[PDB]
Amino acid sequence: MLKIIIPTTMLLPMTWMSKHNMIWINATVHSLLISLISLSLLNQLGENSLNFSLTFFSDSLSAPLLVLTTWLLPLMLMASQSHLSKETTTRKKLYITMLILLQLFLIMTFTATELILFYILFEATLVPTLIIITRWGNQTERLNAGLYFLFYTLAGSLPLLVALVYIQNTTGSLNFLIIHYWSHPLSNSWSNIFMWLACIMAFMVKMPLYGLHLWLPKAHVEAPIAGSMVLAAVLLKLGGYGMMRITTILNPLTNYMAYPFLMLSMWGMIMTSSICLRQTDLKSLIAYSSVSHMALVIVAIMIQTPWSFMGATALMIAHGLTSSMLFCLANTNYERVHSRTMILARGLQTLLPLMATWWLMASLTNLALPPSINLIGELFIITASFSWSNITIILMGMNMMITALYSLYMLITTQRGKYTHHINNIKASFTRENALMALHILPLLLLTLNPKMILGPLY
Amino acid sequence: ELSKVTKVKTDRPLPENPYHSRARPEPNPEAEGDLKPAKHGSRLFFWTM
């Protein structure tokens, strides 16, 4: 795995010693090269995970996420070039280093074999994210958003730390392989119930769950474009990955303890999508759509059926790409109009046609237009829930309807109607912005061709 | 001269246990054979060495 980790580390000295005119260029080049190298990990075995060493391993769950992170870094740099263009060289290098550190941490999280190592790194991801949000945010709510995000995540994580150490003391090892081979069923004792809660709540906080999702709107809206990209593309999937890993030692208590969270998420998807319907901020709308799409994954993980897990992995990858793209488009519009009010800018389709096409394709992916991987994951989760209970189809179909409604509503309000007259600073789309949108869309549509790669280890 | 420590050739037997002390407890096992490297090093969570 060091074939990916070591170059990622070597990015930092390069960025620090790169010329002020070559910082972005060098970073983008070598980040793309690192993504190319990470592509090799997709060759997962049929049964055994790719155990590179005692500390790092990968499976058909970890590899897509690793590729996603290594691919997301260059696009984040490209997006960050615009607003961080009047910054001093040292601070620009600092931002690049924060992004690189975040990518390195995420790689190690997705490859860590030891559960406590995963906890350490997955909670280490907070520091770069917090710094990015609080320092390079544009509004005054950035400080409160960072506080909310950090405190939510820590309040979830600390009981998880206690529980993990308890497991290490009792079982003797926290290695995923040993934990899976030496799995022992949990009883219904209150101690086991609280252990299950401690092991689940942290990941429930990580991937916004209705009731504990209050941090996400603030974080996504206040954070800079790159920060929002990671927040909505990988940092949320951290919760899903950790939950799928930790559910191995949380059975059969999951059957009894899932009902609260299952109902919370099944109603939360509807609630959040309805909230999207009546939103005035573009980034807030995108964030709430993310909340709903992640609630789908939460349901899938809780049900613990093989189809559910496959759909969960596919949905995670698809949502990462789509949400990052949506935030990038909103960022371009925001940079041009210097406001996040959705109704402020209207009829942008006339002024910017190609960006409007990008908007259309992104919204289509958001509403899970067949045969996009978004639809593949959503349909798999829907079928798994239908097997769990036939009544689920009601809420699932209603959520699909509301998602389509609010996505098309966003497209109509922004990229349709009479153009706003006073807004005269809408210049033609830059090549960089179009390239960013293309590098978000094309991989997803290509992934639809060979979904087996992103269908998880249960394929 | 009266302050000089003198020898006394008594016939009374020397008390075997003048303090009437109880049997002293057995000492703990003392040391062992040689030192060898830790089986897998510092088996502290994720550390392999």
Using a CB–CB cutoff of 8 Å, tell me whether B45 touches chain A: yes
How many angstroms separate the Cα of A389 from the Cα of each of A210, A259, A385? 21, 12, 6
- Residues A44-79: b if buried by 16+ CB within 10 A, e if exposed: beeeebbbbeebbbbbbbbbbbbbbbbbbbbbbbbb
Judge contact between A107 and A70, C-beta under 8 A: yes
Q: How far is CA A396 from CA A265, A318, B41, in A?
A: 11, 18, 52
Contact A116, A172 (CB under 8 A): no
Report which of A369, A349, A345, A368 is spatially closest to residue A359, judged by C-alpha positions.
A349
CA distance linking residue A211 with residue A260, whole number of Å: 12
Residues A55, B45: C-beta atoms closer than 8 Å:
no
Chains A, B: CB contacts under 8 A, how many?
14
Chain A residue with Cα closest to B47: A55
Distance between CA atoms of residues A324 and A68, nearest Å? 11
Cα–Cα distance measured from residue A328 to residue A331, given in angstroms and rounded to the nearest whole number:
5
- Token match 């050739």: residue? B9
- Enter the tokens of residue A135: 């320092």
The structure tokens listed for A228 are 């929002």
> Chain B residue closest to A53 (CA)?
B48
Three-class secondary structure of residue A112 per DSSP: strand
Q: DSSP for A59-85, please give it.
A: -TTHHHHHHHHHHHHHHHHHHHHHHTT
Question: A113 contacts in B (CB within 8 Å)?
Answer: 46
Is the minimum CB–CB distance between B48 and chain A shorter than 8 Å? Answer: yes
Experimental method: cryo-EM
Cβ of B46 within 8 Å of Cβ of A168? The answer is no
Cβ <8 Å between B48 and A54? yes
Rounded distance between C-alpha atoms, residue A152 and residue A158, angstroms: 11
